[PDB]
């Protein structure tokens, strides 16, 4: 199917110390594969997945240099932004950048991303045409004009269309049996007696990958949306995910209600109920 590479970068100011903390995490298909943390004793991009382990020292030094330069770039931009927003001295401030590429199921570039948040709020984003910028506010307009002048979008487009795609291809092959594989949800229902004449059908999806999933509860045939409790899809820690969906039900009416699980790994949607 389709695939994606994302680098998520964060620089955070804090009252007190000369230089802010810079972190970069790389994901192939929303599975962590590299990390850089300026706090670590020996700051460097490190492998966060076994298949990435077979890149050589030159790979690691070149990517590290990019992180070190990014650190400098975020440091300067943090200060530039202080002035743009007429923020005084100190405060805690944050700058986020997301970037990368989506491929289709044919492995060709579907969409490129290059975008920034200041203080958790959209600042500037490279448009989908990969040539023009959307600027969230007047401050961002300054940046936009600046980057229009320097032709920075051309730089970004070249990375997005070229390097990003070309190396995502290399990673998809190298870690073949992890990224291009799916793990389907193991599904089951636990039962929890409640107040008067009310039990609680919780329906579990465990151990799936990727993270996108959907759970519904049905009675007689009409999907139940209200009355129902959902939890946010959560990492199990081992590369997989969990979710559950629960509902209110009277005693006796267990074999009426049915949970459905919708996941890419399934040959088809999944149906189930309480099993005494």
């Amino acid at each position: 199917g389709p695939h994606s590479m994302r680098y998520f970068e964060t620089a955070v100011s804090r009252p007190g110390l000369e230089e802010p903390r810079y972190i970069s995490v790389g994901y192939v298909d929303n599975k962590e594969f590299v990390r850089f943390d300026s706090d670590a004793e020996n700051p460097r991009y490190e492998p966060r997945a076994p298949w990435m382990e077979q890149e050589g020292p030159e790979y690691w030094e070149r990517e590290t240099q990019k992180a070190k330069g990014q650190e400098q770039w975020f440091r300067v931009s943090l200060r530039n932004l202080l002035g743009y927003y007429n923020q005084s001295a100190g405060g805690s401030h944050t700058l986020q950048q997301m970037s990368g590429c989506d491929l289709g199921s044919d492995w060709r570039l579907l969409r490129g991303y290059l975008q920034f948040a200041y203080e958790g709020r959209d600042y500037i984003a490279l448009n989908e045409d990969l040539k023009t910028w959307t600027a969230a506010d007047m401050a961002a307009q300054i940046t936009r004009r600046k980057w229009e002048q320097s032709g920075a979008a051309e730089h970004y487009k070249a990375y997005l269309e070229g390097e990003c795609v070309e190396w995502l291809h290399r990673y998809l092959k190298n870690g073949n049996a992890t990224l291009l594989r799916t793990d389907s949800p193991k599904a089951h229902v636990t039962h929890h007696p409640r107040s008067k004449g009310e039990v609680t059908l919780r329906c579990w999806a465990l151990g799936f990958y990727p993270a996108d999933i959907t759970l519904t509860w049905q009675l007689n045939g009409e999907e139940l949306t209200q009355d129902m409790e959902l939890v946010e899809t959560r990492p199990a820690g081992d590369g997989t995910f969990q979710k559950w969906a629960s509902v209110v039900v009277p005693l006796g009416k267990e074999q009426n209600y049915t949970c459905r699980v919708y996941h890419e790994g399934l040959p088809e949607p999944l149906t189930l109920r309480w099993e005494p």
Binding site: G26, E63, K66, L81, K146
Partner: peptide
């Protein structure tokens, strides 16, 4: 492989 920025904010 990671992007890198050029012109600052």
């Amino acid at each position: 492989k990671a992007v890198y920025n050029l012109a600052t904010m």
